[PDB]
């Protein structure tokens, strides 16, 4: 096949102008889409807070309007899913990945409304969920919509615009362009065969997407954590240790969301009334925990800089890790529209800080800053639970801008994905497609 | 397919430990190799420097001892590559892309000493060529070597260990672990078919390589440029216009590196004596220029900070670029072992700083610093010519640490790889492997 290859080499990278122009517009809309979704989640969270002030004396009535406000918005988002689009539950990255395998469809007439208003419900209520799973699945259908609308044909276009959507989706969710392209290249794409996802076009989407987000969001960064210290060569072995710690815990975490998917399904058995109620009770608990123990609720981006700087006790870091493990399961395993990415950065930060702390006491000859070990553990649960370490690495690099820690961040990430693989553990976006395709058949 | 897919998903990312333990060992060797290649090149640049000392009076004698030190070292490399390993001329990245398609051979017993000592020759005489083409080629051969030594079996273990070597090779050549992994994904994998390159093994190779580099090179960095300013949004369109210039000139420069490969061959006709005698005059010219105007010679990493800090005039920036466009072709199209990668980074940096200065005069309302356009243009040729912008972006990023410019950098990047496609240009590392397979059935 030498003569075939000489022909193919010469015809390399020649994406057809119609796909390159259409990637521009999918970027832009997914951009505006994500920016709105983010301004909305904010607006509800605020009104929610301005109600606690209308009631700030009667502390019993306070805990009530803290609970019902979240329960109502939770239910409203559970319901909007079961009544009009059910593949918009949970993250939704499994479903866009399935769509790249041509095993699940892109019902953009129904999920666009359901995911967006459904997320706004669960996210605005202060449940422990991200913006990523939502802007990603949303960004995907926004790609399909423009496909079906301009009726472009071929595999390249359907797979490219489906990709650029899902990529520009995650770019605009984290002001993280490189992370999004890398997310499609490392994780989203079909992992057992070839692909015609034009990568140049995914770039054009991401560019437009990120430019839209910049228009509405500059002068304030999602995480500001400032320049930390460097990492000396004789400290690396400590991050590889920290990585092994993530490697044996990554698979343990995947098992819990799946079993808890099961264990929570036993409460509603499919019954759409038992389920929408269970959502309110889960949602209302976060809105309450939001008021009375705020580090255990919400998406957890707010306690990332606090933990890094060292401002939590080792005691409080333990409390937050347990409680936030528990609430992330209750919120994500339940099916409520929203992702688990964001909550996994917090849990990861909150761990590495606790490690850095112990690392400091045991070795003062190292002159350790405990915040370098939290920057390393941030992208660490993404390595050992979803096995996309190159993405979480460039993601954490894009958000915290501490490049001098590139090696300990890599080292800890390989540390985690290797021990995860070796201890018998499954990538989480893939072990969810499996149980979802397994039932799209075992019913026959 | 669903039965198929459900079975494959549940069994995803399970690289045979054998392959992983063997990946760590590839990068440890490609690192030391890459470390030692670079210590060599410096050492001989120093001799040329210190032997210019003893002859610092007779200005004609001085001009000549730099000619001879460079010309003699130049020749040793043209010969060592003609006599013992011809595929180790030029950069060698085409040759490893060839190898991954199972369309070229990996002669490690031959190319490692040819490339290594051949490169110390052309690099150390101060020829317009970088360490990357050499270290990437060396690195795969090194990852092939261990395969054989342990008799590991499979296409995976052959394609993995050959890759984790070429990545951990570009990593140790620029202290660029991400831009290491990105090359294998973006440019040096089988580009038309799925393959069983285990990313998780490429990774473990890049770590071990880089850790080796940091053991012999820390506290110091190859390009230090400061922290330049930020880029207002009412400024991004200037970074589109830049990419449009790179987008058209990218392919033009590809025609010349391809064209002049053919025209230097007409000189020596393929004859090891007409050829080694030619590259000794090329290599002896670079050693003379490196003194009478050193910015028109060498790899070019010296002038990048002098350029980005706005320290050049508009004139000197026009000279340095044209002069370097010339000495770049002469060194690489002669086949002398050494990459064109780094001598392009210098090209884009020079072009950026020029565009930068022009903007600063037309738009004082934008409060501009030309340095930012230098950082935008730095990876712009590596986007318009070798057409690998994701690796180029992340490379310049990992080397200049001005992440606040990631948006103009991505916009100039695409602005080239787009306008190059729309002016009929070709991935140069595949316009070579193309031509190098064309005579292999002719």
């Amino acid at each position: 096949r030498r003569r075939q290859l000489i022909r193919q080499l010469l015809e390399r990278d020649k994406t057809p102008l119609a796909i390159l122009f259409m990637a521009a517009v999918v970027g832009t809309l997914v951009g505006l889409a994500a920016v709105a979704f983010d301004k909305g989640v904010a607006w509800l969270q605020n009104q929610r807070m301005g109600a606690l002030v209308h009631t700030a004396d009667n502390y019993p009535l306070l805990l009530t309007v803290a609970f019902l406000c979240s329960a109502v918005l939770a239910m409203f988002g559970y319901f909007l899913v079961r009544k009009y689009a059910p593949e918009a539950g949970g993250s939704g990255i499994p479903e866009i990945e399935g769509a790249l395998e041509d095993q699940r469809p892109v019902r953009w007439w129904r999920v666009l409304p359901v995911k967006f208003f459904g997320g706004l419900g669960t996210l605005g209520g202060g449940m422990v969920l991200g913006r990523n799973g939502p802007t990603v699945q949303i960004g995907g259908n926004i790609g399909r919509m423009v496909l079906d609308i301009f009726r472009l044909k071929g595999d390249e276009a359907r797979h490219t615009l489906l990709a650029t959507g899902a990529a520009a989706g995650l770019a605009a969710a984290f002001n993280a362009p490189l992370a999004g392209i890398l997310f499609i290249i490392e994780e989203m794409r079909p992992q057992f065969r070839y692909t015609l996802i034009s990568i140049k076009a995914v770039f054009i989407g991401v560019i437009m997407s990120t430019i839209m987000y910049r228009i509405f969001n500059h002068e304030v960064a999602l995480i500001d954590v400032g320049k930390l210290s460097d990492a000396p060569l004789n400290t690396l072995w400590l991050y590889l240790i920290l990585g092994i710690i993530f490697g044996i815990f990554g698979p343990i975490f995947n098992k819990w969301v799946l079993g808890m998917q099961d264990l929570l399904h036993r409460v509603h058995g499919g019954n759409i009334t038992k389920w929408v109620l269970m959502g309110g009770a889960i949602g209302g608990l976060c809105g309450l925990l939001g008021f009375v123990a705020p580090a255990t609720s919400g998406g957890g981006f707010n306690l990332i800089p606090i933990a890094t700087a060292g401002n939590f006790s080792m005691g409080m870091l333990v409390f937050i890790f347990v409680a936030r493990v528990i609430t992330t399961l209750l919120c994500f395993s339940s099916g409520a529209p929203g992702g688990i990415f964001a909550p996994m950065l917090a849990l990861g930060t909150v761990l590495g800080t606790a490690f850095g702390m112990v690392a400091v006491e045991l070795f003062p000859q190292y002159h350790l800053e405990a915040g370098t070990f939290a920057i390393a553990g941030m992208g660490a649960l993404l390595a050992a639970s979803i096995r996309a370490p190159l993405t979480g690495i460039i993601l954490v690099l894009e958000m915290t801008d501490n490049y001098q820690l590139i090696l300990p961040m890599i080292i800890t990430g390989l540390g985690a994905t290797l021990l995860a693989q070796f201890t018998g553990g499954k990538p989480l976006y893939s072990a969810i497609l499996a149980r979802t395709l397994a039932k799209q058949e075992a019913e026959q | 397919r669903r039965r198929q897919l459900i079975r494959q998903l549940l069994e995803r990312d399970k690289t045979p430990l054998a392959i992983l333990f063997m990946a760590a060992v590839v990068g440890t060797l490609v690192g030391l190799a890459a470390v030692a290649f670079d210590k060599g090149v410096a050492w001989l640049q120093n001799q040329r420097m210190g032997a210019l000392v003893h002859t610092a009076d007779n200005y004609p004698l001085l001009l000549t001892v730099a000619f001879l030190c460079s010309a003699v070292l130049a020749m040793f490399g043209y010969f060592l590559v003609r006599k013992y390993a011809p595929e180790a001329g030029g950069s060698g990245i085409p040759e490893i892309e060839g190898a991954l398609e199972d369309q070229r051979p990996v002669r490690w017993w031959r190319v490692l000493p040819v490339k290594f000592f051949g490169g110390l020759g052309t690099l150390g005489g101060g020829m317009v060529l970088g360490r990357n083409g050499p270290t990437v080629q060396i690195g795969g051969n090194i990852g092939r070597m261990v395969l054989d030594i342990f008799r590991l079996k499979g296409d995976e273990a052959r394609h993995t260990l050959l890759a984790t070597g070429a990545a951990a090779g570009l990593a140790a050549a620029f202290n660029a672990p991400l831009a290491g992994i990105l090359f294998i994904i973006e440019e040096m994998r089988p580009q038309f078919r799925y393959t069983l390159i285990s990313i998780k093994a490429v990774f473990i190779g890049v770590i071990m390589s880089t850790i080796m580099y940091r053991i012999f090179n820390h506290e110091v960095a190859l390009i230090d440029v400061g922290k330049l300013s930020d880029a207002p949004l009412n400024t991004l369109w200037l970074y589109l216009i830049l990419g449009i210039i790179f987008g058209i000139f990218g392919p033009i420069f590809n025609k010349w590196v391809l064209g002049m490969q053919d025209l230097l061959h007409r000189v020596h006709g393929g004859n090891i004596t007409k050829w080694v005698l030619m590259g000794g005059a090329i290599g002896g010219l670079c050693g003379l220029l490196g003194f009478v105007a050193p910015a028109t010679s060498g790899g070019g990493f010296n002038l990048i900070p002098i350029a980005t800090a706005g320290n050049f005039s508009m004139g000197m920036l026009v000279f340095i670029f044209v002069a370097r466009v010339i000495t770049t072709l002469l060194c690489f199209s002669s086949g002398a072992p050494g990459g064109i990668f780094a001598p392009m980074l210098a090209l884009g940096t020079v072009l950026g700083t020029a565009f930068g200065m022009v903007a600063v005069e037309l738009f004082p309302q934008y409060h501009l610093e030309a340095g930012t356009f230098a950082i935008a243009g730095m990876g712009a040729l590596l986007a318009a010519s070798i057409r690998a912008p994701l690796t180029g972006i992340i490379l310049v990023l990992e080397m200049t640490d001005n992440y606040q410019l990631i948006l103009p950098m991505i916009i100039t990047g695409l602005g080239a790889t787009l306008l190059a496609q729309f002016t009929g240009g070709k991935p140069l590392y595949s316009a070579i492997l193309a031509r190098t397979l064309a005579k292999q059935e002719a």
Partner: antibody
Amino acid sequence: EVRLLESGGGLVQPGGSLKLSCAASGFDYSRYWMSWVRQAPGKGLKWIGEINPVSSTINYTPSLKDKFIISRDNAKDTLYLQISKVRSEDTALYYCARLYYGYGYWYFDVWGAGTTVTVSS
Amino acid sequence: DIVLTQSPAIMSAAPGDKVTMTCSASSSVSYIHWYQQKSGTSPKRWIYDTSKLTSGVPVRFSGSGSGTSYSLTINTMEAEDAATYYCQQWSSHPQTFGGGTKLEILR
């Protein structure tokens, strides 16, 4: 140049106290750990303590409680050392050091001129 | 804490002459540093990480060693080399300097 200039030593009476001051010039005084090391007349170098840029970890040698107080004033680019309950043992030449490392085995990077403390009645 | 003892407490040696002092340790120690103190001047960092010369230290200086026994050496001494060489470790907390070795000219 990089200049470490300490002052503040002199004659002090047993039981007294003094506050030595090291003023920095020629480098970002933040981002650096700073350290105090003294040298009794006719003896070797002895380590007092250190202090990280955000003042969030201060380490002093095995020597008593509020004997030593190391502080820094990043805004003034000055390093301070307070010695209390001064003995004759505290008569020495006091040095100011900027800490760094190589492989991560930390060394005393650039030293200052010194200042002398005399503890006599 | 770890004790360092620099062995030739005082010593002399002619110019153009090999000189060799010692730093020993009560427990094992990693990567030692050396400072050269001339009377009236701040101690100068001289040699770090068991072996690595500092910028400006002339190439006649060198160190090597391992575990619990390192040393410093001058291939060909000079006049300017007369001073006091302090070893100091930080492989263990807290760091410790040695007693000193006074290097005097022999004449």
